[PDB]
Amino acid sequence: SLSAAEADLAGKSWAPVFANKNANGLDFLVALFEKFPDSANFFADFKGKSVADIKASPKLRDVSSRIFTRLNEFVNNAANAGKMSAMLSQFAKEHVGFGVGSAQFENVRSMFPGFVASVAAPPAGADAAWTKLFGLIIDALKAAGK
Ligand code: HEM
Numbered sequence: 001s002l003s004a005a006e007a008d009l010a011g012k013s014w015a016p017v018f019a020n021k022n023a024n025g026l027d028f029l030v031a032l033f034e035k036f037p038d039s040a041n042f043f044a045d046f047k048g049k050s051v052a053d054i055k056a057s058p059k060l061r062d063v064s065s066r067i068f069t070r071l072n073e074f075v076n077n078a079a080n081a082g083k084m085s086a087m088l089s090q091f092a093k094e095h096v097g098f099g100v101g102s103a104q105f106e107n108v109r110s111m112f113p114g115f116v117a118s119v120a121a122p123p124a125g126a127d128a129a130w131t132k133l134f135g136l137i138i139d140a141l142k143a144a145g146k
Pocket of ligand 1: 039042043044045066067070071095098100104108
């Protein structure tokens, strides 16, 4: 888990992004698909589609919102080893069954900070807090078989 200070930092950096959940969620998904083209292929709804098509899809909103809702939950419990364990296990188990591995999460992690910074400059120490959270997810995926 993160420390209370670290969770705090992550939370502070997230609030501005989450404040406009609909628009920022869509944006995050889009950026991922742009930086790492292969990711769209894991999605049922998106495999084969270009970014423009994805942008135009009525399915986009459902997908990005479920992603932000969940990430929000992670940020809000990151400092509780207790909730983290349950959250991480279940997220990792779910994702491996869809065929998603740690490598996909290494990509997310590499682009996250730049994504946040696109919304508002994060506070000092936030970037390391996220890389730390993302690191916990990665380990969970490697423990789940991928
Ligand atoms: C950024 C961190 C991510 C979060 C918080 C997250 C969250 C979720 C959640 C909550 C759902 C299930 C929603 C529901 O059915 O109610 C989901 C499903 C899924 N996610 Fe993720 N996801 C993340 C990253 C990704 C990435 C990187 C991939 C692909 C590379 C992805 C691939 C999948 C797939 C294919 C499903 C199956 C659901 C569907 O396609 O309909 N996830 N994820």
